[PDB]
């Protein structure tokens, strides 16, 4: 019956493709061709945070748009004061092979993980005056590539063993394990309502999970290579994923298929980070070509370049008020662009 | 600046601490140790005393940080750039055992390791000699035409391994170990100092 099951799977895939191609009456470009372009967007380096000595792999903005946490392979996670360039904390990590970091929405906690397969939670507001490790979550057999705080108590992690998990920081046991990816899950982004999230893996596909029931609601596959970043549209009904195919694509949850792709002939390097603007009009994508490009997400035309980094930019983030965008890079320098 | 002066002073203090840790940690030599399974990596890493296994030892006023990453059961491409700044690569080959050739070709021609020089170790010399005395060396190599002696077979294997590199900015230091010795630390130290001298001499506009 194995051949029958394979034939059934092929027929289901063909039905999915036919249904998706039935609803594509018109493309996004033919609809947004009637709107005015944003024009040239020049952003200047307002601040430069020179504290890290090794390559920076992650950054995250605080919910107050002022505090930022950055992680490097020097073994340090530093919380920054963006307005005054001051450093408020300097957390030494047990393992220096860290490839992700997170800032809790409340602001009392930070997370950090990497090649040690353990996600570590740090308490920032301890009564003893220092920062202490509240929890060390160890349930992954592969490197943790991303992590995001649902609230002060639960955190969702993405690992390189083709799984994403939902944790309970109080007890340290995986509440829900999400399975179905064929390759390493390299990115993750929780929705604004925080009821569902998307994960981009190395199997050139992005699956739409939901934390409550743990079932892959939808699967999007339009890329040609490994997906390195993903980010939810501010409306929460769409997301953009940038892959190593030197392209990024916009997928619609309700339409269930890709809408636009942001590619250029003179771009060969793959994306490392993707982030949106407060209004969802700009799509700032970080590239391995040492530069960050700003894409007019409705017209799929480039609107600017955030040049000024001396190495590949590994992380990009936009504050919650949309005032500024911060870019980390392997040259151990983070810059605030406004 | 009412009490923001105290915040600034705390920031300066922690920046001074950061520079102190950076200065202290800049004296370590980071070596990425690779090879196939049961190739002698564990044997030699403990000769000088589950995500990543790190071993540290000190030889002649140099701190050698040795990383074994063979325990990562995932594709190298997604995390191998974390080791782009290693001083060298220590490759272990079991002479008395094709997969190693493919692994060496993949790791020596990587985009992140174009300039990183490898240190090649050929362990199990005595076992290789015994196998040669028992079995011909053409079993593993169909295209090997020559004498069935130990020296020429070892030289042929070393040449086959060194044929896999193309860049002229890197060198392969091939050393043969019988595993009944404690000289591996000296070989690693000499290779490391030679690599450092070569890199510095490149950086001086003199190479």
């Amino acid at each position: 019956e194995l051949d029958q099951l394979r034939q059934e799977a092929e027929q289901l895939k063909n039905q999915i493709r036919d249904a998706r191609k039935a609803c594509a009456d018109a493309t996004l470009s033919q609809i947004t061709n009637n709107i005015d372009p944003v024009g040239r967007i020049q952003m200047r380096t307002r601040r430069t945070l020179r504290g890290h000595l090794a390559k920076i792999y992650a950054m995250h903005w605080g919910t107050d748009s002022r505090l930022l946490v950055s992680a490097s392979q020097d073994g340090k996670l530093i919380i920054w004061d963006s307005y005054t360039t001051n450093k408020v904390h300097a957390i030494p990590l047990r393992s220096s092979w860290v490839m992700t970091c997170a800032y809790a929405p409340s602001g009392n906690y930070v997370a950090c993980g990497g090649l040690d397969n353990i996600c570590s939670i740090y308490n920032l507001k301890t009564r003893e005056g220092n920062v202490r490790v509240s929890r060390e979550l160890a349930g992954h057999t592969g490197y943790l590539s991303c992590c995001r705080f649902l609230d002060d108590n639960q955190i969702v992690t993405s690992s390189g063993d083709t799984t994403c998990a939902l944790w309970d920081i109080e007890t340290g046991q995986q509440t829900t394990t999400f399975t179905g990816h064929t390759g390493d899950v390299m990115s993750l982004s929780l929705a604004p309502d925080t009821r569902l999230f998307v994960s981009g893996a190395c199997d050139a596909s992005a699956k739409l999970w939901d934390v409550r029931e743990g079932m892959c609601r939808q699967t999007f596959t339009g890329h040609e290579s490994d997906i390195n970043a993903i980010c939810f549209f501010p409306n929460g009904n769409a997301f953009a994923t940038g892959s190593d195919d030197a392209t990024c694509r916009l997928f619609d949850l309700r339409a269930d298929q890709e809408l636009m792709t942001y590619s250029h002939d003179n771009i060969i390097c793959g994306i490392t980070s993707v982030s949106f603007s407060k209004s969802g009009r700009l799509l700032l994508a970080g590239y391995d070509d040492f530069n960050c490009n700003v894409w007019d997400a409705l017209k799929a035309d480039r609107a600017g370049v955030l040049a000024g980094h001396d190495n590949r930019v590994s992380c990009l983030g936009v504050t919650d008020d949309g005032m500024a965008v911060a870019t980390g890079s392997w040259d151990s320098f983070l810059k605030i662009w406004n | 600046s009412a009490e923001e002066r105290a915040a600034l002073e705390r920031s300066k203090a922690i920046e001074k601490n950061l520079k102190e840790d950076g200065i202290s940690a800049a004296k370590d030599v980071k070596l990425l140790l690779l090879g196939a399974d049961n190739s002698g990596k564990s044997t030699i890493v403990k000769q000088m005393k589950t995500g990543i296994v790190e071993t540290h030892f000190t030889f002649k006023n140099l701190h050698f940080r040795l990383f074994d990453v063979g325990g990562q059961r995932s594709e190298r491409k997604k995390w191998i750039h974390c080791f782009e700044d290693v001083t060298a690569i220590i490759f272990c080959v079991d002479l008395s055992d094709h997969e190693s050739l493919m692994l060496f070709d993949s790791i020596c021609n990587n985009k992140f390791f174009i300039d990183t020089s490898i240190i090649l170790f050929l362990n199990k010399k005595d076992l290789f000699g015994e196998k040669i005395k028992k079995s011909p060396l053409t079993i593993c190599f169909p295209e090997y035409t020559g004498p069935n002696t130990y020296e020429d077979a070892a030289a042929y294997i070393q040449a086959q391994f060194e044929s896999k590199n193309r860049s002229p900015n890197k060198e392969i230091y091939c050393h043969m170990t019988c595993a009944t010795d404690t000289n591996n630390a000296q070989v690693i130290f000499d290779a490391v100092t030679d690599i450092i001298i070569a890199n510095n001499l490149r950086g001086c506009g003199l190479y």
Partner: single-chain antibody
Amino acid sequence: DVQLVESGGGLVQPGGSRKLSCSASGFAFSSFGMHWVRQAPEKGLEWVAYISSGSGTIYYADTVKGRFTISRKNTLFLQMTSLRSEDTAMYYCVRSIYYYGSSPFDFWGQGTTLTVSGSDIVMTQATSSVPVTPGESVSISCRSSKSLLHSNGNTYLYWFLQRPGQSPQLLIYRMSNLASGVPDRFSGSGSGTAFTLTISRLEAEDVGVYYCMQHLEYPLTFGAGTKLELK
């Protein structure tokens, strides 16, 4: 737990010298700035000296500069020299870690009773005693000679509570932020120079004396002290 215990108090002849020790345990003492706050037997609090983290910057009171010395084993010292008749008081040990969003003056020491045989911001509490009954809303007020609002939007007014027979405890820092462990019944508000603390649903444990303090510039000046009493 956090513990700040003082020792070195006793009868002192006038014109002599003494040293006060502050043994600290339960927190990272190295990263905390330490203050010395003294209170006369019948009067309010009066800031004395402050030593920052790493012994970087030290500030002294006008009536204290030259005579005293502050130094910080996990212990804080105060070298008192040439003690006058006005130096008799109870001296407190206060920890005041400073960074963005921190809560200075959060924990106060027990205190040691020592008995001896011009441009400063003046903060005045108009009412020195207020009769109040449990379950009602009591509003204490404070005023400042100079505006406490800074260019960054932070107003530096702190509200403390001294229960009878107990050391002061921080309630509101920067005039609007509630401290850690303080019940929600306390609120703070103010505008530049006039500040107000509102207590809702007053209980039996909320009785005591309330002091308003400024942290805009040293020396830090305390309020006169409004004493709330039951019935």
